[PDB]
Symmetry: C4
Subunit: 322 residues, 4 copies
C-alpha cells in the first residue's frame, strides 16, 4: 500500500473532478503578486495620464503649455502624453515635482486630481495589507517540531508500548501542545463494506489528559498496546508481513509564530523497530541541562523484548496460574 502521509508531514492525496479575494492573495506567488500590483499602478497611471492628456488637448494646452497673461492651461507643462503621464504619476505617487502643476482654470482637472489621489490612496492601502496578509500567513513554515524517523516497540513498566519521539527545535515554547496517533489502512466491514483508508485511533492518553505534553526537552510518546489497541494481536513476526501506516500528529499553539500548527509524520509498519529504545538526548551538567539533537533519531537493541504480541503476553499469564 502507498503512503498517506510522508515523513516531512506532507499529505499524499490528489483531488479531482471537484474563492475569497483575501485567501487568494495568500496563495498567489510573491513575484505574481508584485507583478499584479505593478500592473494595478500602470493601469491607473496610464488611465489618468490619458484623462489628463485628453483634457490638455481639448483646452488647447499642447500649443501653449506654459500659458501667458490671457491663456492658462488646466495643468502646466503638459506638452504631450509623456508629460501628461508624468503628471499622473507625480500626482498619484504624490512625488509632484511641480514642473507639471495643476492650475485653477479647469474644474474637471481639479476633480481629476482629487479622484486620482483617493484612488492612489486606496491602492496603496490594499498593497500594504495584501503584503502582511502574505507575510503573516506563510505557506512555507519552518519545521520547528521534529519527529523521530522511527517509532519503536518496547516494554515500559510491564506493558508493551509503541513509542515515537517528538522534539522542539526552537527554544520558543509550544502552548497547549497535545499529541494524537492514528493507524491508517483499508479494511472491509463485517457487512462487506470496503473502506479505502480507515483511520483508527492509537490511544496516547486522551481520557486522563496525558496526551497533553509540556515539550521543552524531546519527549517520547507512549502508546500502551493492550486489549483496546489495534496493535494488540500484532507480534514482531506479524510486523514484517503486515502492511499498515501510523500517522503521528502534534498540534499546538506555537508562540514563535503565534498561530496554531499541526505537526505530522508517518511510520509505515516497515519503519517501526521491534525491540528498540531511543538514545538519551538530555544530559546532566552541573550548571545547565543540555539536549544533544545528534542522538535524537538513534536507538539501541533490547534483546530482552518479547517477540510475541501484547495479547500473547496477556494469554501467557492467565495460563501459568492454572
Amino acid at each position: 500500500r502507498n503512503r498517506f502521509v510522508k515523513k516531512n508531514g506532507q499529505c499524499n492525496v490528489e483531488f479531482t473532478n471537484m474563492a475569497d479575494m483575501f485567501t487568494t492573495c495568500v496563495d498567489i506567488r510573491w513575484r505574481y503578486m508584485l507583478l499584479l500590483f505593478s500592473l494595478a499602478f500602470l493601469v491607473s497611471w496610464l488611465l489618468f495620464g490619458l484623462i489628463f492628456w485628453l483634457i490638455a488637448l481639448i483646452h488647447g494646452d499642447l500649443e501653449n503649455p506654459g500659458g501667458d497673461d490671457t491663456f492658462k492651461p488646466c495643468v502646466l507643462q503638459v506638452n504631450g502624453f509623456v508629460a501628461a503621464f508624468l503628471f499622473s504619476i507625480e500626482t498619484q505617487t504624490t512625488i509632484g515635482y511641480g514642473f507639471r502643476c495643476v492650475t485653477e482654470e479647469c474644474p474637471l482637472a481639479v476633480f481629476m486630481v482629487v479622484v486620482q489621489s483617493i484612488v492612489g490612496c486606496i491602492i496603496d492601502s490594499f498593497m500594504i495589507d495584501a503584503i502582511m496578509a502574505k507575510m503573516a500567513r506563510p505557506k512555507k513554515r519552518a519545521q520547528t517540531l521534529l519527529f523521530s524517523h522511527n517509532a519503536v516497540v518496547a516494554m515500559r513498566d510491564g506493558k508493551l508500548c509503541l513509542m515515537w519521539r517528538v522534539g522542539n527545535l526552537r527554544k520558543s515554547h509550544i502552548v497547549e501542545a497535545h499529541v494524537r496517533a492514528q493507524l491508517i489502512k483499508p479494511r472491509i466491514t463485517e457487512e462487506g463494506e470496503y473502506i479505502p483508508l480507515d483511520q483508527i485511533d492509537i490511544d496516547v492518553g486522551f481520557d486522563k489528559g496525558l496526551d497533553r505534553i509540556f515539550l521543552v526537552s524531546p519527549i517520547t510518546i507512549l502508546h500502551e498496546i493492550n486489549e483496546d489497541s489495534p496493535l494488540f494481536g500484532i507480534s514482531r513476526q506479524d510486523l514484517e508481513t503486515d502492511d499498515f501506516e501510523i500517522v503521528v500528529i502534534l498540534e499546538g499553539m506555537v508562540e514563535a509564530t503565534a498561530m496554531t500548527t499541526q505537526a505530522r509524520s508517518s511510520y509505515l509498519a516497515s519503519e517501526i523497530l521491534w525491540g528498540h529504545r531511543f538514545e538519551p538526548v538530555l544530559f546532566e551538567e552541573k550548571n545547565q541541562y543540555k539536549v544533544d539533537y545528534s542522538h535524537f533519531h538513534k536507538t539501541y537493541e533490547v534483546p530482552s523484548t518479547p517477540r510475541c504480541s501484547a495479547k500473547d503476553l496477556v494469554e501467557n499469564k492467565f495460563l501459568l496460574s492454572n
Copy 2:
C-alpha cells in the same frame, strides 16, 4: 416544521424587538466604506482649504498673491478659494506641487500646515487599518468544507448508525477539527413545558475523543444508534412520518484562512436515506492516492439493511435466547 439550518449552513432565524466602531467597519459594505473615507478627505480638504482661504483674505493675499519686495503672502499663489483648496489638498495628500507654497510670514498659516499634516497622517492610518480589518475579517468565506447532501442509516460492524460525509475542498489542512451533531425539534416536557426548538445531542464520539477527525480525504461521520441515541426507537417506517431536523457541525482552525470556522449543514428527516451507503471517493493508484469529488454525494442501496429501529434489533436478540 420549517428549517432551522439550510444545506449551505445558513441559519434560518429572525431577531425582532431587540456597537463598536471596529466591528462596524467590518460590517459596512465596501462601496459604503470607500464612499465614507472619500467623504472624510473632502471634509478635511475643504475645511482646511477654507481655513487657508480665510487667512489669504484677511492678510490681503488675493490682491497680491505673488508678493513683492515688501508684501509677502502667508501662502503663495492662493489667488482664490480654488487655489486655497488646491493648496490644502497638496498639503494633506503631501503632493505639494509647490506653486502654491506656504511662506514664513504668517505663524497661523504655519501652525495650520502642521495641524493638517498630522490630521492627514492620522486619517490615512485609519483608512489603511480599516481596510485590513475588512480583508482579514471577511463576511463571505468560501466553503472550503463540504457536507454530503444526505445522511444515511446503515449497519457498520453490527450496529445501526446514522452517517454523513465531510470533505475538505482545499488541500490546506484543518487543525484541531472536531465534529458535532444535533437533533432539532420542538418538544413538550413531562411537566407540560413547550420547548419551541429543543436541541438534543447526537453523539459522534466526544467521550473517547473520536469526534476529533484528521480530515485529509473525505471522512464518513458515524453515529451509533443505541439506547442513548434519540433515533433509538425510530425505524424506517417512522422516518417517513417523523418530522425532525439534524444539524451537522464541523468546527476547526483552517490554516488557509488562519481563523477558526464553523461548518454547517442540515439533514431533515426526509433527507436521510435508510438502507444506503456512500460511494468510495478515495482510489488506489500506484503512485498517489486520489479523491474524486464527483462521487462525493452519491450512494447505493443496501437491501440487507434492517427496516426496523435499533431498539427493535436489540429487542430481537433478547427474545431469541429465551
Copy 3:
C-alpha cells in the same frame, strides 16, 4: 455579602499594594495616544529644523539664502528658523514644496535629509501600527451575548434544575461556545480555614460535553440539582435566608470580532426565582422562525413547583416505598 460579578459582567475587585510597550499603546486613551504622536512629530521636526538652522547659520545662508554665481546655500531659502522648520516639516512629511530645497553643497545637510527621511518613515510605521493595535484590541466590546436578568428553579423531566437563558444579539455566530457556572461564597473548612470567596462549580454538563452549546436562538442553560450539586439541600424557604452568588459564564470564539470572548453575568440568591419558567421567544412562522427579544427576560409562575429542596424530594421517594 457584596457582589463579585455585576449583571453587565464587570468584576467588582480592587488590587492594592501590587509593562510591555505594545500592550500600553492598547491601554492609553485615544486622545492621549493622538497627543503622544503629535508630540513625536514636533520633537522630530523641531529637532531637525534646528539642525538645519544651525547648518544654515554656520555656512552663512541667512545672509544670502538664494545664493549666486559663487555662493550656494546647503538648503535654499532657509532665511530664518521658521524656514528651517518649514524645510524640516516639508522633508519628513515629504510635502517638500521645494521653495526651500536641499542643494549639493553641504554633505552634512545631505546626510541630514537622509536621516530625517528614515526617521520620518519609521515614525509613520509605528503610528499606523499603534492605531490598528488599538482598533483590533478594543477595551470596549459591545455585549453581543445577552444573559437573562434572573436564573430560575423549576422541574424539567422529573428533576429540579437551576436555569438561566443566554442569547446572541448579532446574527453572527459564536464558534466553540461553551458554558460554565460557579457558586461564589465565603466558607470555612473542617480544619478551620477561612476562604474569603470559595469558587464552587455548578455543573452544566461538562462531562458528556453538553456544556457545548450551538447558540442560534436563545438557549436555556440547565443545571440539575442533585446529590453532587451545591444547591442540593437548598429549598425555597432557604433561598430567602441564604446569601450566595452564582456567576454564569459563556466563553466562545465570536466570528464578528474574530477573537475569543468571556461573557459574564451574576445571579445573587435573591435574584433567583423559585417556581418560574421563561417566556418562549422562538415562534413558528410558515416562512421563517423568529426570535422576539422583548420576552427574553420574562418569566411566568409555576405553582406546581415543589417548594422543598432537591434532597427533600429525593428523601420522599425512598420513604414512600417503605
Copy 4:
C-alpha cells in the same frame, strides 16, 4: 539535581548539535532591524541614484544640466552624482523638491522613475509590516500572571493536598484559563531504562474540569495527594531528603494581549512548605472587595498538620477499625 524550570518561568535547557523570513523579523533585535531597513533604502537610493547618474552622463546633462532652446536633460539639475543621488532620494521617498525634476526627453529615465516608485512603494510596505510583526509578536511579555514563591502541603476537608497560588496582576481577564502541574525527576524503569527527566502529571482536576479556573482574585490550586498521586508515599521527613521538582503551569487566552500565554513557575522539593497555608489576600469591604497583593506569597504555620505521608494517614484508618 539542577532545575528544569526557574521561578520566573524560564526553561533551563540548551540545544546542541541541532527558517522563515517572517519569524526571523520577529527574532532579530530592534536596532538590527532598523539598521537592516536603513541599509535597504541606501542600497536602493544609491543603486538608482547611480542609474540616474549614468543616464545623466551619456546624454550629456553634466555639461548643460539646465538645458536651453535645443538641449533638454533627461532629469534637470543633475550636475553631478550628488544631485543624481538627491533626485533618487526625492523620487523614492517622494519628497521631490522639484529642482531636480524628470523631463520628457529620455524614455529610459521615465521608465526608471516608474520602477523606483514601485520599488520604493514595495519597500515601505515591507517595513510597516515588519514592524507590526515585531510589535504584535513581542518576545518580552510582562508577567501578568503571578505564581506564589512556595507551594505548601496541608489538610483541606479531610485530605492531604499540595497547594500553590496563582494571581492575575492586571484587571484584564484571562479567558479559558486552565492549570496543570507536573513532577519532574529522572527515573529508571523496571526494565532498567534510564529516563533523564521523566515528566509525571500532578492532577489538579482535569477529569471533572475543575482544572478550569475563573481567575479574578488569586486562586489557590489544590492537588489531592491520594493513591494516584506521586506524592502519595512522601511524608515531611521524606521531603527534606527527596530531590524532585514541581512545574506549575497556567495556560490562558489573555484579553489584554489577545494571544494565548503559558505561565510557568517551579517548586523544588526544598521550596515546598509542609504544614503551611497562605495569607488571605481578599478582604471584605462594605462597598468593594479588595485584593492586597502584599500578602500574596505569605503563609502561616499549621502545627496540627500530619507530618506523615498521605498513604500513612490512609493506612492508619484501616488499622484502627480492626
